[PDB]
């Protein structure tokens, strides 16, 4: 009913600025708090700043200075302006309300999709699809050389999803990131039944279909 | 009066033998004596209802009637345990009980076989004592014998020891006989507990689908309707057998016998001399009965199930009766497809409709349906052809050795001696059916899987060693074979130790046949398999042929139980360096 | 200064079994000001008590709440798995831009031990024509998360060209999943041909390796 969206994270090259946008639909949320609350890799969670149904806006220490909340109450929509962004800014950003009722207090029931903020100096980059051939075996595929993250990987459109594991990504010693996404399957459906592995990286609109066949 | 009622119908004699069969099935550790007793006694009192079916007490359930007999010696735990419970019931909930207490695997010792004489002796003396015995052990020992066809089995049985009893080498015409009526006795006993299973876990719907499949199979020429007509029959005759209600099911079989070779010119060419025989010869007949020649020019499916603009429409309306002419259709035209492998790519058609019809084109989500058939038709063939091959290459008995290992690293749980059985049993599905062109295979191999494949789940249900094994039988009925097939190397599993008496073969050894000698063997290798399964590949191919080896020299070494005692407590760490 | 330790780090319980997670904040939070949130991987976090033993609309009853002051406790009467995730718990303290959530506890469950079934894919073609080889090494569905995956090209062990990734605990069957990733140059590649991978884990009596020479099939 009620949810927040939010966009506009990205990958941002340091010292650069960025403008996360928070719009809610399905409330009116002009009475409300909004808060700002990011999550490096790995990390917990830290909280950034407020804005009330008023224009009032609170930060933690740390963050006033660089970041900005604002709101567009003819639109719905609260900001979140990142300048100087340095690379411990690279973190999930969400966008959570205060529940009605409080206003200092750390409690934030509606959250947000939450958007994922890459700062690096480095060069937005695809991600190449290779099949790790099967050997009941499995297979899967092999999803090298991307920038920055998210990736998302599917089996057959969909189709296929039990037994699927998409690994966490990693940054390659070369600073790109890397993962692999395998499924298990029945051996004797190799070969008669066919396996795609559905590739798609957004922030370089790349997409892949790679077929994974055994090998020999 | 219903016990009249199926009394006039049946015939005195079938009449006994199902109420015996009924009471051996029910009561599977009661004396032959017993039974006897209770079942001429339920037969007089069918005779007085003959007599006069309103005379009192003739109007009463078979259940009531059967049930009550059952419990004149059924207050006796000392001998059965837990039946008294059923007695202190009320029908339907006496009978319900019962059912549920039926031993799949009695404590029961097969009965070895005597000589010729010695049974021709036998049944020359009392012949309906002989046949009555026979009955009764069977129907023991396999609680869910199709009763009907147990009648058809013990009438070729009688007839077998009427021809052979009074032949110049009575053994000779005797034995390959009775080998033959038992190969086809535990074939149907198994054939029939995966229908009752179907029944009893999945619904009357599920029968009646495979029913649709198979039935359309075989009489590819009849109308949609005939068959409709029949498995709705041929499922109210199991439904009653497998309920316990032999009686009535052996009555109501007679009767879909008899409409089946009253209408052959509207189900099947083949029928002709099944409907010649005598009503037992009969039903036997036309369940073996071939399949009909398919007719000529049959037209393509994705017209009616694919491009029509009611598809939805009719897919909505009736689902059952639009599915059903889809199996009905894809199956006549399938000969060669498993039963089972029909019912997947109904399946198939019916989740894409369930999918596709309520989107917002749904004609054209659902264009492509029959191309999700291709892989799932092939994989069963490649597996097929494939393990045919390797059946070719290992033979009967190092292709159980390959099973063996597989299915003892699957399930390492499982009792050694269960596993020898139900993988020889399996390995036997390579000679069996890779005999048959790629036309007739599937059918054949994969519907007999099913079968000792339901066996070793029902057997399991009993005594649970392993979940994964738990999960297949209850899952998909129509997938036992996949999901079995699917399991991989279970790493859990510790090894079972190692008794060094477990690894040493005796003199006794020597004096049995040579299929004794394989389980002996293939049993010790399902321990070797269970005291180091993850790491051993064919180095266990190795063991194996150093057994065979060895067993083969110390059976000719003029030994004194010797080459075996020595070369055992002490030659185990010999070869177990490895 | 403010300074909120949350603690055990992480900690892994049976089903039906108690868990309970602390969180000691240094200034004693301000009047009840202790929050309690359960973030599902990808997901994000989700209220689950607030005021330290307030649950909100849509909370399991088995969440409780308990302490006062400097001390705060989080207890789960009766673990369900649905309950796998990392908690954690947000307080105030009077400076409101000095609002601080907990380390936060990583909750796992219990289930019986079970080896990793290994695979081992050597490098795609079309990956070689790039001159770069990545051989993985897939430890599927396990339990304890502990193993370990050491490489071994003809003989030689490795070290410093492998990184590996694991995901988290299933939400089926309670299990981890492994991938172990050798990457090395073409020329490194082809110099070789005994690629193995050798698995250590609590579920093995004995540590398994699964290799392959490459070229052969």
């Known amino acids: 009913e009620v949810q927040l969206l939010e966009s506009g994270g990205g990958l941002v090259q340091p010292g650069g600025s960025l403008r996360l946008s928070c719009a809610v639909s399905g409330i009116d949320l002009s009475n409300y708090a909004i808060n700002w609350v990011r999550q490096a890799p790995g990390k917990g969670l830290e909280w950034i700043g407020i804005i009330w149904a008023s224009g009032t806006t609170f930060y933690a220490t740390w963050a006033k200075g660089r970041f900005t909340i604002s709101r567009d109450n003819s639109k719905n929509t609260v900001y979140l302006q990142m300048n100087s962004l340095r690379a411990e800014d690279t973190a999930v950003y969400y966008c959570?309300?205060?529940?009605?009722?409080?206003?200092?207090?750390?409690?934030?029931?509606?959250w947000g999709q939450g958007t994922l903020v890459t700062v690096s100096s480095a060069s937005t980059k695809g991600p190449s699809v290779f099949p790790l051939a099967p050997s009941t075996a499995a297979l899967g595929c092999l999803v090298k050389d991307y920038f920055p993250e998210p990736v998302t990987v599917s089996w057959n459109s969909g189709a296929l999803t039990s037994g699927v594991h998409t690994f966490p990504a990693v940054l390659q010693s070369s600073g790109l990131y890397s993962l692999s996404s395998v499924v298990t399957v029945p051996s004797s459906s190799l070969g008669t039944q066919t396996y795609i592995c559905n590739v798609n990286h957004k922030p370089s609109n790349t997409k892949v279909d790679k077929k994974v066949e055994p090998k020999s | 009066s219903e016990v009249a009622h199926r009394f006039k119908d049946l015939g005195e004699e079938n009449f006994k033998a199902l109420v015996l069969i009924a009471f051996a099935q029910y009561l599977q550790q009661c004396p032959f004596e017993d039974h006897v007793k209770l079942v001429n006694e339920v037969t007089e009192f069918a005779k007085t209802c003959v007599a006069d079916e309103s005379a009192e007490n003739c109007d009463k359930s078979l259940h009531t009637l059967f049930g009550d007999k059952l419990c004149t010696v059924a207050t006796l735990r000392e001998t059965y345990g837990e039946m008294a419970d059923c007695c202190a019931k009320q029908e339907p909930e006496r009978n319900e009980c019962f059912l549920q207490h039926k031993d799949d695997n009695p404590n029961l010792p097969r009965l070895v076989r005597p000589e010729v004489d010695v049974m021709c002796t036998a049944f020359h003396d009392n012949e309906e004592t002989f046949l009555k015995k026979y009955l009764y052990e069977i129907a023991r020992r396999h609680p869910y014998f199709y009763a009907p066809e147990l009648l058809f089995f013990a009438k070729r049985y009688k007839a077998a020891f009427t021809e052979c009893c009074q032949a110049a080498d009575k053994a000779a015409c005797l034995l390959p006989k009775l080998d033959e009526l038992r190969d086809e006795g535990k074939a149907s006993s198994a054939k029939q507990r995966l229908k009752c299973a179907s029944l009893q876990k999945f619904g009357e719907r599920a029968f009646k689908a495979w029913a649709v499949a198979r039935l359309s199979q075989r009489f590819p020429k009849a109308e949609f309707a005939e068959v409709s007509k029949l498995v709705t029959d041929l499922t109210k005759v199991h439904t009653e057998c497998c309920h316990g209600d032999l009686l009535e099911c052996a009555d109501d079989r007679a009767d879909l016998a008899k409409y089946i070779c009253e209408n052959q010119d509207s189900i099947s060419s083949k029928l002709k001399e099944c409907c010649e025989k005598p009503l037992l010869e009969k039903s036997h007949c036309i369940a073996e009965v071939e399949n009909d020649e398919m007719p000529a020019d049959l037209p393509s499916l994705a017209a009616d199930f694919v491009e029509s603009k009611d598809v939805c429409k009719n897919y909505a309306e009736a689902k059952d009766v639009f599915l059903g002419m889809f199996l009905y259709e894809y199956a006549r035209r399938h000969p060669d497809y498993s039963v089972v492998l029909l019912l997947r790519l109904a399946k198939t058609y019916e989740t894409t409709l369930e999918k596709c019809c309520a989107a917002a084109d749904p004609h054209e989500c659902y264009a492509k349906v029959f191309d999700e058939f291709k892989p799932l038709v092939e994989e069963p063939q490649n597996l097929i052809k494939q393990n045919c091959e390797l059946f070719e290459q290992l033979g009967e008995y190092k292709f159980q050795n390959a099973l063996l290992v597989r299915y003892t690293k699957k399930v390492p749980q499982v009792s050694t001696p269960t596993l020898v059985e139900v993988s020889r049993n399996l390995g036997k599905v390579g000679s069996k059916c890779c005999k048959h062109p790629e036309a007739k295979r599937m059918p054949c191999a994969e519907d007999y899987l099913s079968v000792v494949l339901n066996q070793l789940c029902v057997l399991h249900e009993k005594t649970p060693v392993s979940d994964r094994v738990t999960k297949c039988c209850t899952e998909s009925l129509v997938n036992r074979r996949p999901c079995f097939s699917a399991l991989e190397v279970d790493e859990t599993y510790v090894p079972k130790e190692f008794n060094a008496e477990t690894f040493t073969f005796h003199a006794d050894i020597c004096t049995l046949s040579e299929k004794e000698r394989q389980i002996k063997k293939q049993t010790a290798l399902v321990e070797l398999v269970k005291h180091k399964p993850k790491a051993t590949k064919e180095q266990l191919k190795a063991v194996m042929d150093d057994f065979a080896a060895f067993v083969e020299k110390c059976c000719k070494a003029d030994d004194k139980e010797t080459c075996f005692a020595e070369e055992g407590k002490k030659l185990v760490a010999a070869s177990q360096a490895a | 200064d403010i300074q909120m330790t949350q603690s055990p780090s992480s900690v892994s319980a049976s089903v039906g079994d108690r868990v309970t997670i602390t969180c000691q904040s240094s200034?004693?939070?301000?009047?009840?000001?202790l929050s309690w949130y359960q973030q599902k991987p990808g997901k994000a976090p989700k209220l689950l008590i607030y005021?330290?033993?307030k649950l909100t609309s849509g909370v399991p009853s088995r969440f409780s709440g308990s302490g006062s002051g400097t001390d705060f406790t989080l207890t789960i009467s009766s673990l369900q798995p649905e309950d796998f995730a990392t908690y954690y718990c947000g307080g105030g303290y009077s400076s409101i831009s000095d609002t601080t959530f907990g380390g936060g506890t990583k909750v796992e469950i219990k289930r019986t031990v079970a080896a990793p079934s290994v695979f081992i894919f050597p490098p795609s073609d079309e990956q070689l024509k790039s001159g770069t080889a990545s051989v993985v090494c897939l430890l599927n569905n396990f339990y304890p998360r502990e193993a370990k995956v050491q490489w071994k090209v003809d003989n030689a062990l490795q070290s410093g060209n492998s990184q590996e990734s694991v995901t988290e605990q299933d939400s089926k069957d309670s299990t981890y999943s492994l991938s172990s990733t050798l990457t090395l140059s073409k020329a490194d590649y082809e110099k070789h041909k005994v690629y193995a991978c050798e698995v250590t884990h609590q579920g093995l009596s004995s540590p398994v390796t699964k290799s392959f020479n490459r070229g052969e099939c």
């Open positions: 005021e330290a033993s």
């Open positions: 200034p004693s939070v301000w009047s009840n000001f």
């Open positions: 959570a309300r205060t529940v009605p009722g409080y206003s200092t207090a750390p409690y934030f029931d509606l």
